RNA sequence: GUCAGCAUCAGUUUUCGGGGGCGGAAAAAGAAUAAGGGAAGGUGGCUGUUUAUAGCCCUUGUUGUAAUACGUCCACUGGGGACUGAGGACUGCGGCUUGCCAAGGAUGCUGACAUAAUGGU
RNA sequence: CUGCCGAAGUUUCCGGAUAGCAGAAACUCAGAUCAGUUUUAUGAGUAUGUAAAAUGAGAGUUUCUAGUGGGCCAUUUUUGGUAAGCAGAACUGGCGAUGCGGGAUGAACCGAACGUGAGGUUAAGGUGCCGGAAUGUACGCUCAUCAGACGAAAAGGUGUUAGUUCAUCUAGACAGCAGGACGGUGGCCAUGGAAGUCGGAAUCCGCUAAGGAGUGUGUAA
RNA sequence: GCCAAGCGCGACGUUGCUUCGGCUCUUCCUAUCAUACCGAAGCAGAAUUCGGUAAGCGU
RNA sequence: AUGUAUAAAAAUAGAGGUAGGCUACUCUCCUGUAUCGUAGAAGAUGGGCGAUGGUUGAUGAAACGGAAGUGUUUUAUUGACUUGUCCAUGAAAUUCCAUGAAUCCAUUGCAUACGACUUUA
């Protein structure tokens, strides 16, 4: 089928927090 | 479809500079509007000439003088990457300067995933002597006895009756 | 590179036909048929020269040209001189008894390390096993295919393996001594 | 092999407005493009891609990068016209071409013609 | 281009998904498709990769009556039918009627060994895969995951090829006689102007 | 990264000048040509460095550089070459040869024996005695401590009771056949000095005579 | 009454062509034909050379007001398809010549079918 | 039952008033005034505030009478930071009163804002099949025994592909074969001993084409 | 702290002393105690130690 | 359904032949836009000329097909048709699209909550 051990496609909550992770990276670079 | 455009421009005349210097660039763009925009970008980044203070005095497309003569073109470019600072030199064999630039843009976006705005062409030259060629694949093209079987042939009318020949 | 080629000069060998990439090399000693379908290479035959040609091939595929060249040269050597492997028995205490059946295609090994299990190995086709009287405890494997002869030697050596013992002190085993041609 | 992309080889155009026209490879531009020329005036010298043409078995002795006049002179001297027609491949293409511009009355005459052709079915026992 | 009421497709040398995608659309178009030699189908990717793909598929099972779990079919025709079935709206009555118009078999049984077998150029491996790309055969993949009739199909196919060759020689010999007698009739050259 | 063979490195710090070394050899060759006389053409043969030093000891200097490097530096054309008629002498000039100043009789007659090498042919067919091996072909009036030689030889020598034993006889070489790799290596550890270093006294580049004989 | 087919128009629209202006390096080329220059991925000849028993590149002249492509325009033109027909004497703006008209929104010519088609439920 | 208009979503003062947003009634106003807008000019510090052309729209007030006074999400600036989260403002946005196309599915993403219909054409997203629409055209890259289609980070890989720089190269490039790889010297200490390669300090030398006080194996040495 | 490839930091190195809690049960994971097979070690043999494949089977 | 028309195999960095002695020949490929079949009041009525074939209907067969052989031939007849090449009649106003067993009731106990199961009759 896929041979992977995890679903490559994540959940909508998981991708939503990734944009939050991208927000954190902007916080680390710009201000933090 | 890219086009080579000669763009000549200068800042608006003023009392301090009644005879402003006219700067010319040979730059490629799909249309005149893009070419004049790219010209202004390069002029600002080099001479610090503001777009409002300047004006475009001449725009002219340049056709290939010898579109039926196969040539080799060497292009120096300022590649923009993750670090955003890289210089590259590439050589393409074709019959038109526009075609070589089009192949250059396709190659860079393919190998290095560089966009049109990140790439800036520094200079395009025609390497007429075989010896100055630096690329092995190009040199193999300039060999006198170049001959090779056709690669990547591959060939609605679904449901063909017989099997494809896929050969000579 | 557009063009990468290797050239081979064929010997008195009778036929080196490469029909369907299958090399049916027939020589004075014998005939070997092998398959070259695993590689996408052009085998162009002209007189006494054979060319293996690859057009616009990558480094991974270009590596196959020499490998195809070597196996062709090796099998040609087999049909002309052939391959003979001399394996010398090595024992300290228990004599190793070797028996040859149907002209040696099966080798039976007994009394290894005093073990009572008879180790029976059947050699690959085209390999005959003989015991040379010139040197004691000496086994000669002569055949046409270098693949078959060397594999037979590898199988015999691996069968007579020392387990759970200090190899530093236990020297028992059978090992290949020389690898050469019949002439 | 029997077809090699080399200077002077005759090709048949398969894609584009020049489909079915004969040309000769005057130069090798690169792995994917070549410059061709044809003696016919309606066919201009142009750079085409190999995917648009099929390599024919005919090869003419032509110097690298010959101009249109020299190519035409070499073409006439080596009579590549009617040299391609000598092959059964060209006859089939022309026979296919003749058939497609046939009209209804010609098609009616053909069926009578080939049925008169078939009425024999006389083979020695 | 044009349809046939029943179409026999020689699956040898084809690609699983590419042939399945073409077949599924043809079934929805109201055509009846018979696929022969499903054990000779090819799949892009080396055997071990494709074998692992099948093993992962076999792994799907329930803790309550594995009979309620997915039924894993090992026959090459059943593997092809699974590929076609996933490309059809099979939960829908239209897709169900599409499936009943498909008949995928291993080898070429008698009712079809005497019928013409067309091929699909959009799915042929030689026209779709770059040379030097690893691929596997469904017959080998099936026989290694549980299919137990590879040899019987192989033996039966060899006999059919012998009988088919004998039929061809008779047909070829017949065609030569008509070919020889063809130019005997003068009309073929009298009015060959029409391209015939 | 990329499939390439690794290159080993060493800390001996004995790297030669390379191109500068070749230039130094060319300069020394020119100085040797500019030397007073004798115009010798001889540096060494298969003899070792000790023999070359002994030959050069009776000389107040054998210099080879690179073969044909001195000829290339001098120039095939007589105008470029310092000597005369060097156009034909350049082809003759080959191998490790060079000027020396100190001989002719010793070169003609005195030829010290030395260990042989591959490519040449043996003058006889030496044999290896069976059983225990002998270092001097049974001329000792053979130590058994050469245990590592059993593994370092590769011949069918079984190490029984800490002594190398030959299962069957095997001649070291045969007359009329070129010495192979194994034969030369085996002869190196043995006393087979089937070699006689020679000298080349074809011509002499005299300042006045300028007659390089080719006899 | 129902439903059809076609034609000639109006409105909206889509899809193929043809012809002709103008523009740019007043395209670039190219071809043919005269100068000169250079050479090669070096042909005949003899690895090396300079059109010969192949030719190519560069410049200029010429054939020239060459063609063509591309851009743009035509109050230039020929077809194919689809949807729509609101309004209800006459006014108006126009065109051709009292009249006629494609000009302030569809008419004409036929069919078939009512023992059914259409519209329903 | 249908139709029309249609918010606020919160200041400012002590739960109430004022105001704001929405209407009504009654007035005056079109050589007039307005504006979630941009220029010009003045100064002052690319922005700022003040004044005076462009574009758009008919522009004004008075009374009096409803409803509203939340929140959530996101951008930017900034204030601190902390293993790392984040915390504090401001800012205008989006939701909120709002269906619809797409994103497989969705409060916050991309499009788009709604009477009933016919036709045409698009946005966003798409054109292998499910699925309407190119198994299009052209140029490349990629093979994963846990590909790809969407922090764990410093790096590792004899994985592939382009380049950048520096090196040698007919005085013969690497690679491979045939060799040399020497003499003082077993340089000096050390110990069963270590003669380049138990070890510790030196690291000199003549000859060359080149050979170290030795690259490792080895040797009791 | 000393270095410190490099880009004032500065990696590897180096110095400095110092309520919860458990019976049965069901399966499942391997990050494996045993059983099977290999690799290494002064592993003579025997008994081991360490490291791999491995959750079939027990615990 | 509207011709419900078409059976080699394998390769694709090669095949297939013809003509030859696994090797010397040359030719073909480059898809089916092919080949077979196709005139006739859904296909009427006769007459020639020239084949001496083709297409079948009904019998009689013998050989073949087992993978799902349900079809392949070879035929011996008989009945038709023949457009292979020519002729002569007829056609319409449909005067412009529509098409013998098992079961229950009994019996057994090798079985059983009840059905079922195994027996016997």
Curated annotation (Swiss-Prot), chain A:
Protein family (similarity comment): Belongs to the TRAFAC class YlqF/YawG GTPase family.
Domain notes: In contrast to other GTP-binding proteins, this family is characterized by a circular permutation of the GTPase motifs described by a G4-G1-G3 pattern.
Protein known as: GTPase grn1
Record's compositionally biased regions (Basic and acidic residues): 16-26
Organism name: Schizosaccharomyces pombe (strain 972 / ATCC 24843)
Disruption phenotype: 20-40% of cells exhibit morphogenetic aberrations represented by irregular, uneven, or overdeposition of septum material as well as septation and cell separation defects, often resulting in pseudofilamentous or multiseptated cells, suggesting a failure of cytokinesis in those cells. Cultures of null mutant cells did not appear to exhibit a growth arrest.
Highest rank taxon of the organism: Eukaryota
Biased composition (Basic residues): 1-15
Cellular compartment(s): Nucleus, Nucleolus
Function: Required for optimal growth. Required for normal processing of ribosomal pre-rRNA. Required for nuclear export of ribosomal protein rpl2501.
UniProtKB/Swiss-Prot annotation, chain C:
Keywords for this protein: Cytoplasm, Nucleus, Ribonucleoprotein, Ribosomal protein
Note: There are 2 genes for uL6 in S.pombe.
Keyword Nucleus: yes
Name of the gene: rpl901
The keyword Calcium belongs to this UniProt entry's keyword annotation: no
Descriptive protein name: Large ribosomal subunit protein uL6A
A Pfam family it matches: Ribosomal_L6
GO cellular component terms listed in the entry, alphabetical order: cytosol; cytosolic large ribosomal subunit; nucleus; preribosome
Organism of origin: Schizosaccharomyces pombe (strain 972 / ATCC 24843)
Function, as annotated: Component of the ribosome, a large ribonucleoprotein complex responsible for the synthesis of proteins in the cell. The small ribosomal subunit (SSU) binds messenger RNAs (mRNAs) and translates the encoded message by selecting cognate aminoacyl-transfer RNA (tRNA) molecules. The large subunit (LSU) contains the ribosomal catalytic site termed the peptidyl transferase center (PTC), which catalyzes the formation of peptide bonds, thereby polymerizing the amino acids delivered by tRNAs into a polypeptide chain.
From Swiss-Prot, chain D:
Residue runs in coiled coils: none
Family matches, as SUPFAM superfamilies: Translation proteins SH3-like domain (SSF50104)
Gene that this sequence comes from: rpl14
InterPro entries cross-referenced by the UniProt entry: KOW, Rib_uL2_dom2, Ribosomal_eL14, Ribosomal_eL14_dom, Translation_prot_SH3-like_sf
Keyword Nucleus: yes
Keyword hit for Nucleus: yes
Any Pfam family hit: Ribosomal_L14e
Family of this protein: Belongs to the eukaryotic ribosomal protein eL14 family.
UniProt organism field: Schizosaccharomyces pombe (strain 972 / ATCC 24843)
Keyword tags: Cytoplasm, Nucleus, Ribonucleoprotein, Ribosomal protein
Subcellular location: Cytoplasm; Nucleus
Protein name in UniProt: Large ribosomal subunit protein eL14
Subunit structure: Component of the large ribosomal subunit (LSU). Mature yeast ribosomes consist of a small (40S) and a large (60S) subunit. The 40S small subunit contains 1 molecule of ribosomal RNA (18S rRNA) and at least 33 different proteins. The large 60S subunit contains 3 rRNA molecules (25S, 5.8S and 5S rRNA) and at least 46 different proteins.
GO CC terms: cytosol; cytosolic large ribosomal subunit; nucleus; preribosome
One function term, GO molecular function aspect: RNA binding
BP GO annotations: cytoplasmic translation; ribosomal large subunit biogenesis
From Swiss-Prot, chain E:
MF GO annotations: mRNA binding; structural constituent of ribosome
Family membership noted in the UniProt record: Belongs to the universal ribosomal protein uL13 family.
Keyword tags: Cytoplasm, Phosphoprotein, Ribonucleoprotein, Ribosomal protein
Compartments, as annotated in UniProt: Cytoplasm
Organism, as annotated: Schizosaccharomyces pombe (strain 972 / ATCC 24843) (Fission yeast)
Subunit structure of this chain's protein: Component of the large ribosomal subunit (LSU). Mature yeast ribosomes consist of a small (40S) and a large (60S) subunit. The 40S small subunit contains 1 molecule of ribosomal RNA (18S rRNA) and at least 33 different proteins. The large 60S subunit contains 3 rRNA molecules (25S, 5.8S and 5S rRNA) and at least 46 different proteins.
Phosphoserine PTM sites in chain numbering: 192
Lineage, top ranks: Eukaryota, Fungi, Dikarya, Ascomycota, Taphrinomycotina
PROSITE patterns: RIBOSOMAL_L13
UniProt main location, coarse: cytoplasm
Further details from the record: There are 3 genes for uL13 in S.pombe.
Residues spanning the signal sequence: none
Annotated HAMAP family: Ribosomal_uL13
GO biological processes: cytoplasmic translation; negative regulation of translation
Taxonomic superkingdom: Eukaryota
Gene Ontology cellular-component terms listed: cytosol; cytosolic large ribosomal subunit; preribosome; ribosome
Protein name (record): Large ribosomal subunit protein uL13B
This protein's encoding gene: rpl1601
């Amino acid at each position: 089928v896929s041979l992977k051990k995890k679903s490559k496609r994540r959940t909508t909550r998981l991708r939503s927090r990734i944009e939050k992770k991208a927000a954190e990276s902007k916080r680390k670079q710009k201000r933090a | 479809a890219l086009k080579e455009y000669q763009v000549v421009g200068r800042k608006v005349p003023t009392e301090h500079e009644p005879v402003p210097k006219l700067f010319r660039m040979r730059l490629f763009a799909p249309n005149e509007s893009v070419a004049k925009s790219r010209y202004w970008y390069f002029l600002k980044m080099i001479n610090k000439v503001k777009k409002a203070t300047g004006e475009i005095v001449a725009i002219n497309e340049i056709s290939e003088p010898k579109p039926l003569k196969a040539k080799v073109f060497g292009i120096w470019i300022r590649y923009d990457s993750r670090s955003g600072t890289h210089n590259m030199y590439k050589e393409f064999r074709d019959t038109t300067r526009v075609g070589a630039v089009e192949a250059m843009y396709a190659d860079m976006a393919a190998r290095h995933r560089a966009r049109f705005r990140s790439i800036r062409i520094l200079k395009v030259v025609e390497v007429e002597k075989k010896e100055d060629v630096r690329r092995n694949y190009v040199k193999q093209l300039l060999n006198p006895h170049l001959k090779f079987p056709l690669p990547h042939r591959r060939t609605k009318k679904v449901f063909a009756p017989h099997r494809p020949s896929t050969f000579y | 590179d557009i063009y990468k080629d290797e050239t081979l000069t064929i010997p008195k060998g009778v036929t080196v036909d490469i029909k369907a990439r299958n090399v049916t090399v027939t020589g004075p000693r014998g005939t070997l048929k092998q398959n070259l379908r695993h590689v996408d290479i052009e085998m162009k035959k002209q007189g006494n020269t054979i060319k293996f040609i690859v057009w616009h091939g990558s480094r991974k595929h270009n590596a196959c040209i020499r490998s195809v060249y070597s196996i062709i040269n090796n099998m040609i050597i087999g049909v002309t001189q052939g391959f003979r492997y001399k394996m010398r028995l090595v024992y300290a205490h228990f004599p190793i008894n070797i028996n040859l059946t149907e002209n040696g295609t099966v080798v039976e090994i007994r009394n290894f390390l005093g073990e009572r299990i008879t180790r029976v190995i059947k050699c690959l086709p085209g390999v005959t096993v003989s015991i040379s009287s010139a040197v004691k405890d000496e086994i000669i494997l002569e055949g046409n295919s270098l693949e078959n002869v060397s594999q037979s030697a590898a199988n015999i050596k691996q069968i007579c393996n020392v387990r759970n013992k200090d190899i530093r002190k236990f020297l028992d085993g059978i090992y290949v001594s020389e690898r050469g041609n019949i002439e | 092999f029997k077809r090699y992309v080399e200077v002077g080889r005759v090709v048949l155009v398969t894609k584009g407005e020049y489909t079915g026209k004969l040309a000769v490879i005057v130069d090798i531009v690169d792995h994917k493009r070549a410059l061709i020329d044809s003696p016919c005036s309606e066919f201009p010298r142009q750079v085409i891609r190999y995917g648009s043409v099929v390599l024919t078995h005919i090869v003419m002795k032509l110097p690298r990068g010959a101009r249109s006049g020299i190519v035409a002179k070499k073409w006439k001297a080596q009579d590549v016209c009617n040299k391609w027609a000598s092959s059964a491949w060209a006859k089939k293409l022309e026979a296919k071409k003749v058939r497609s511009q046939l009209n209804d009355f010609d098609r009616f005459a053909v069926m009578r013609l080939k049925k008169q052709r078939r009425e024999q079915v006389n083979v020695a026992v | 281009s044009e349809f046939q009421k029943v179409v026999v497709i020689d699956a040898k040398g084809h690609l699983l998904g590419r042939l399945a995608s073409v077949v599924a659309k043809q079934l929805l178009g109201g055509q009846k498709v018979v696929v022969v030699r499903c054990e000779e189908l090819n799949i892009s990717g080396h055997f071990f990769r494709n074998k692992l793909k099948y093993l992962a598929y076999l792994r799907k099972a329930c803790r309550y009556n594995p009979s309620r779990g997915a039924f894993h079919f090992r026959a090459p025709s059943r593997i092809f039918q699974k590929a076609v079935r996933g490309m059809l709206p099979h939960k829908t009555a239209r897709g169900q009627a599409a499936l009943e118009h498909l008949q995928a078999v291993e080898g070429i049984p008698p009712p079809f060994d005497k019928q013409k077998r067309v091929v699909v150029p959009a799915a042929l491996r030689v026209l779709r895969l770059k040379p030097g790309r690893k691929y596997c055969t469904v017959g080998r993949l099936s026989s290694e995951v549980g299919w137990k009739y590879n040899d019987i199909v192989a033996k039966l196919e060899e006999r059919r090829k012998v009988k088919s060759a004998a039929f061809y020689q008779a047909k070829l010999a017949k065609q030569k006689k008509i070919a020889s007698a063809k130019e005997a009739s003068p009309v073929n050259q009298k009015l060959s102007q029409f391209g015939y | 990264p990329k499939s390439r063979r690794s290159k080993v490195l060493t800390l001996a710090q004995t790297e030669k000048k390379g191109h500068e070394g070749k230039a130094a050899l060319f300069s020394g060759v020119q100085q040797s040509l500019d030397s007073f006389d004798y115009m010798w053409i001889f540096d060494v043969t298969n003899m070792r460095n000790t023999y070359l030093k002994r030959i050069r000891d009776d000389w107040k200097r054998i210099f080879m550089g690179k073969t044909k490097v001195m000829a290339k530096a001098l120039g095939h054309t007589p105008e470029e070459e310092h000597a005369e008629n060097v156009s034909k002498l350049t082809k003759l000039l080959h191998g490790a040869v060079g000027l020396l100043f100190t001989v002719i009789g010793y070169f003609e007659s005195f030829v010290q024996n030395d260990f042989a090498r591959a490519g040449a042919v043996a003058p006889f067919t030496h044999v290896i005695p069976a059983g225990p091996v002998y270092s001097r072909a049974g001329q000792i009036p053979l130590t058994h401590t050469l245990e590592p030689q059993v593994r370092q030889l590769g011949m069918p020598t079984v190490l029984k009771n800490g002594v190398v034993t030959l299962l069957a006889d095997f001649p070291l070489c045969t007359e009329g056949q070129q010495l192979d790799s194994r034969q030369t290596r085996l002869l190196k550890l043995f006393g087979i000095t089937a070699a006689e270093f020679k000298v080349g006294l074809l011509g002499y580049y005299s300042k006045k005579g300028a007659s390089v004989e080719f006899l």
